[PDB]
C-alpha cells in the first residue's frame, strides 16, 4: 500500500475519536493520488455514514480508483464543445463548461486551476486532459 | 432540472456560456414558445444566461406553452375529436422540417402514438413534452 | 382553407433537437465529472 505509515498519520491527525468525516476522506484520498467524485462520496455515505474509521477509509480509497479513467473518453468529453474539432477551447469555454456541467467547479477552484494550467486563451484540451491524468496513483 | 436553464445549457453548443443566432430561436422554441417574427427580429445578437433567463421569465409571464401548442394542434384536428392524424404530421415534419433525421421523426411519431392508432391525442402529447 | 404547419413543425423540431442534445450530453457528462475529480486532486 502507498506509504502506509504516512497515510495512517494523516488520517489520525484529522481524526476525532478514531474517525474522520467523509469530506476529510475526500481530501486524504486526493493527497494519496486518487480522484474520487462527489458521487463516490454520496454512494459510500449511503452505506457507511458520514464518519469513517481507518478500515472504512481504506475501503473508500479502494473503491475510488476509477479504472475506467482513460485519455480518449476524457478528451471526447471536451471535444463535444469543440465545433471545429481542431482541439482547442477558450478560457471562457473551459470555465463555463467546468463550472456548469457534471460536478461544477466553484469559481475559486476554476481560478486556481486556470492560474496553474491555462497558459493561453486557446487551451489544447487534449494535452490538458493528459496533464490531469498525470500523478494519478 | 428546470426547463429554461436546461434549454440554455443544451443549446449552448460550444459551451462558452452564450447562445447566438438561430440557436437562440431554437432554444426558445425548445421550451414550447413560438416567438412572433418581431420578437425574433428584436432578439439581441447574443444572450448569456441572465439575458435568456429574463427573456423567458417575461415571455412566459404572458405566454402559456401547453395551451398554445394545444391550439396549434387543434388547428389541424379536422375530425375535432381531440386528435390529429399521425400520418399528416409525419409527412409535414418530413416536408417542412429542417433539423431531424427521418429516423428521428419516426421515433417522435411512435412516442406521440404509443398505440399504433394513426391518431395523436395531442393534449396528452403536449403534456408529455412539457414534463 | 387549411392553415400553415410551419409553427408546429418548428417547435417540435426544436424540441427533439434538444432531446438529441440532452442524450449526447448524457453520454459525455460522466467523463466531465471524471475530469473535475482529477482537477480537484491536482488542487490539494
Ligand atoms: Ca455558445
Ligand atoms: Cl423559422
UniProtKB/TrEMBL annotation, chain A:
The keyword Flavoprotein does not apply. GO terms for cellular component: myosin II complex. GO terms for molecular function: calcium ion binding. Transmembrane segments: none annotated. The keyword Acetylation applies. Keywords: Acetylation, Metal-binding, Repeat. It comes from the Eukaryota. Residues 69-104 form the EF-hand domain. This is Calmodulin. The chain holds residues 77 to 210 of 213 of the full protein.
UniProtKB/TrEMBL annotation, chain B:
The keyword Transcription regulation does not apply. InterPro entries: CALM/Myosin/TropC-like, EF-hand-dom_pair, EF_Hand_1_Ca_BS, EF_hand_dom. Keywords: Acetylation, Calcium, Metal-binding, Repeat. Gene3D superfamilies: EF-hand. Pfam families: EF-hand_6 (PF13405), EF-hand_7 (PF13499). Residues 1-34, 64-99, 100-131 form the EF-hand domain. GO terms for cellular component: myosin II complex. Ca(2+) binds at residues 12, 14, 16, 18. The keyword Acetylation applies. It comes from the Eukaryota. GO terms for molecular function: calcium ion binding. PROSITE patterns: EF_HAND_1, EF_HAND_2. SMART domains: EFh. This is Calmodulin.
Amino acid at each position: 500500500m502507498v506509504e502506509a505509515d504516512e497515510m495512517y498519520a494523516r488520517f489520525n491527525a484529522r481524526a476525532s475519536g478514531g474517525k474522520v468525516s467523509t469530506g476529510d476522506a475526500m481530501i486524504l484520498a486526493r493527497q494519496l493520488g486518487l480522484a474520487p467524485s462527489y458521487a463516490d462520496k454520496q454512494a459510500f455515505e449511503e452505506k457507511s455514514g458520514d464518519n469513517l474509521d481507518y478500515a472504512s477509509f481504506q475501503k473508500f480509497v479502494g473503491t475510488s480508483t476509477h479504472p475506467e479513467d482513460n485519455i480518449e473518453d476524457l478528451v471526447e468529453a471536451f471535444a463535444y464543445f469543440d465545433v471545429s474539432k481542431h482541439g482547442y477551447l477558450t478560457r471562457k469555454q473551459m470555465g463555463n463548461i467546468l463550472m456548469t456541467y457534471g460536478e461544477p467547479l466553484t469559481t475559486e477552484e476554476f481560478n486556481a486551476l486556470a492560474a496553474e494550467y491555462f497558459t493561453s486563451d486557446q487551451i489544447d484540451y487534449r494535452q490538458f486532459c493528459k496533464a490531469m491524468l498525470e500523478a494519478e496513483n | 432540472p428546470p426547463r429554461v436553464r436546461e434549454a440554455f445549457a443544451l443549446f449552448d453548443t460550444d459551451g462558452d456560456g452564450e447562445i447566438s443566432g438561430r440557436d437562440l430561436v431554437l432554444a426558445i422554441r425548445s421550451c414550447g414558445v413560438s416567438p412572433t417574427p418581431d420578437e425574433i427580429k428584436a432578439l439581441p445578437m447574443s444572450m448569456a444566461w441572465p439575458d435568456f433567463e429574463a427573456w423567458m421569465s417575461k415571455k412566459l409571464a404572458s405566454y402559456n406553452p401547453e395551451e398554445e401548442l394545444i391550439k396549434s394542434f387543434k388547428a389541424f384536428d379536422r375530425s375535432n375529436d381531440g386528435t390529429v392524424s399521425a400520418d399528416e404530421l409525419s409527412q409535414v415534419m418530413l416536408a417542412l422540417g429542417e433539423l431531424l433525421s427521418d429516423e428521428e421523426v419516426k421515433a417522435m411519431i411512435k412516442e406521440a402514438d404509443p398505440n399504433g392508432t394513426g391518431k395523436i391525442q395531442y393534449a396528452n402529447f403536449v403534456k408529455m413534452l412539457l414534463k | 382553407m387549411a392553415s400553415s404547419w410551419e409553427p408546429l413543425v418548428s417547435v417540435l423540431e426544436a424540441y427533439y433537437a434538444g432531446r438529441r442534445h440532452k442524450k449526447q450530453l448524457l453520454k459525455k457528462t460522466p467523463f466531465i465529472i471524471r475530469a473535475q475529480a482529477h482537477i480537484r486532486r491536482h488542487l490539494v
